[PDB]
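A further point concerns the way the authors explain their paired sequence and structure data. Since the whole study asks how a given chain folds, the encoding of that fold should be made plain. A single example would do more here than another paragraph of explanation. An entry of this sort, consisting of the sequence and the corresponding backbone structure tokens, reads as follows:

_____
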Amino acid sequence: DYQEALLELIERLLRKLNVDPRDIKRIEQQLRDLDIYQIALLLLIILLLRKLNVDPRDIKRILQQLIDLDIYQIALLLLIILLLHKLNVDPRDIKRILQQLIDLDIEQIAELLLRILELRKRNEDPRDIKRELQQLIDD
């Protein structure tokens, strides 16, 4: 069962992040209702936040918000935060940006990702890409 295997990796990561076991149980229960694409993408986002040294309680809170999104939203968010890390955006800023993106609808997120990619292709400076993304989010 590939879903169960992926769920066990998530449970292991949450334990290594000192997430309260009571919260792990409630999270695991919610994850068991998602499809395998959502579960795998959520695993990746956890791995990325862990790589950025995001505080465990913040990872837990962010995960709980992401569990309510569909595969398309979760995937596009992963790509955005991967690009922001590549551009050396401070993890504290990536965290705050991710919290804002979660409330946006899928069309806006897809448009933002395209915009970031367009600007990268145009050789725009990392700080300019961050500032423009932050401005488009506030809009």
Notes: The longest helix spans residues 36-51. The two ends are 43 Å apart (CA to CA). The chain has two domains: 1-68, 72-139. Residues 1-68 form one domain.
